[PDB]
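thread from #wetlab-drylab

HS: before we spend reagent money on co-crystallization trials with beta-D-fructopyranose, can we at least see a predicted complex? here's what I'd submit
DV: go for it
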Amino acid sequence: SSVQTAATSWGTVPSIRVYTANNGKITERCWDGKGWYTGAFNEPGDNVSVTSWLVGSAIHIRVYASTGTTTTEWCWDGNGWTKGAYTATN
Ligand SMILES: Cc1c(C)c2c3c4c1OP(=O)(O)Oc1c(C)c(C)c5c(c1C4)Cc1c(c(c(C)c(C)c1OP(=O)(O)O5)OP(=O)(O)O2)C3
Ligand SMILES: Cc1c(C)c2c3c4c1OP(=O)(O)Oc1c(C)c(C)c5c(c1C4)Cc1c(c(c(C)c(C)c1OP(=O)(O)O5)OP(=O)(O)O2)C3
Ligand SMILES: OC[C@@]1(O)OC[C@@H](O)[C@@H](O)[C@@H]1O
Ligand SMILES: OC[C@@]1(O)OC[C@@H](O)[C@@H](O)[C@@H]1O
Ligand SMILES: [Zn+2]
Ligand SMILES: [Zn+2]
Ligand SMILES: [Zn+2]
Ligand SMILES: [Zn+2]
């Protein structure tokens, strides 16, 4: 078995974020033009997907973390990771 990843990027530098699900936990690695460093994201999950969009130069990141049949959305909007309103019936 193997770790599972999800990736997003934005701009032309670019910024890149790679999320890795390992051991029921998702962590984050970051590229902003000058080497890979560890990001603030740390949430439970066996499976991860991600999307992001810009408003002007402000990134908005949504990470979908799944454990069992429960998927939780995590939101980055410039000032801390918050829990999003996403729900599903799995
Ligand atoms: C935590 C975890 C994940 C995230 C998994 C799988 C397993 C898993 O539980 P684990 O405790 O590792 O138990 C297993 C052990 C010990 C072995 C030896 C296994 C498998 C599993 C089951 C089956 C398995 C799985 C795979 C993939 C890609 C392979 C090749 C694969 O066969 P292989 O590695 O020979 O055989 O999918 P993936 O890794 O994404 O999903 C399924
Ligand atoms: C507790 C447990 C259950 C109930 C599972 C699975 C696993 C499992 O974890 P574990 O056995 O510790 O880790 C694995 C290990 C050590 C190996 C070598 C595995 C698998 C697993 C994953 C993958 C796997 C699973 C299967 C089936 C039918 C096969 C053939 C099957 O490939 P197999 O050649 O055995 O590879 O479904 P099953 O209903 O058994 O579901 C999936
Ligand atoms: O500059 C790094 C950082 O703030 O970028 C936005 C998000 O990816 C955060 O988790 C991360 O720590
Ligand atoms: O600002 C957070 C939020 O409203 O952003 C858009 C969607 O991701 C929603 O689920 C989420 O709660
Ligand atoms: Zn393996
Ligand atoms: Zn898988
Ligand atoms: Zn687990
Ligand atoms: Zn905004």
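DV: The domain at 1-84 is CATH 2.40.128.190 (Lipocalin).
HS: ok that's useful, forwarding to the group
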